[PDB]
Structure 1
Amino acid sequence: DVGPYSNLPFKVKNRRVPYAVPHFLFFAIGMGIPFFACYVQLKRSGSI
């Protein structure tokens, strides 16, 4: 089964949910973690 979609850990074609949702959620979590950390540490220290 050696081919151009064989060495990736994730499936790209012939899939139920389209690939745009797993691709977008990765970057969304990666850009949304250090805002959650700042929100928690702002709310723990008095300020809004």
Structure 2
Amino acid sequence: DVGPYSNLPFKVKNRRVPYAVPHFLFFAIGMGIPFFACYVQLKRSGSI
């Protein structure tokens, strides 16, 4: 099954949910994790 989409750990075609959701969620979580820590530590010390 050697070919162009054979060495990738994730499936890109012939898929129930379109690949856009998995692609966008990765970057959204990556760019949203550094805000949750700030929220937790701000709410742990009085400030809103």
Q: TM-score scaled to structure 2, two decimals?
A: 0.99
The residue aligned with 2:40 is: 40
5+ residue gaps in structure 1?
A: none
By how many angstroms is 1:39 displaced? 0.2
The structure 1 segments of at least 4 consecutive aligned residues displaced by more than 2 Å after TM superposition are none
5+ residue gaps in structure 2?
A: none
**RMSD of aligned alpha carbons:** 0.2
Q: TM-score scaled to structure 1, two decimals?
A: 0.99
Separation (CA, whole Å) in 1 of partners of 2:37 and 2:6 = 37
Aligned-residue identity in percent: 100
Instruction: Report the number of matched residues.
Output: 48
CA offset digits 1:1-48 (Å, max 9, x no partner):
000000000000000000000000000000000100000000000000
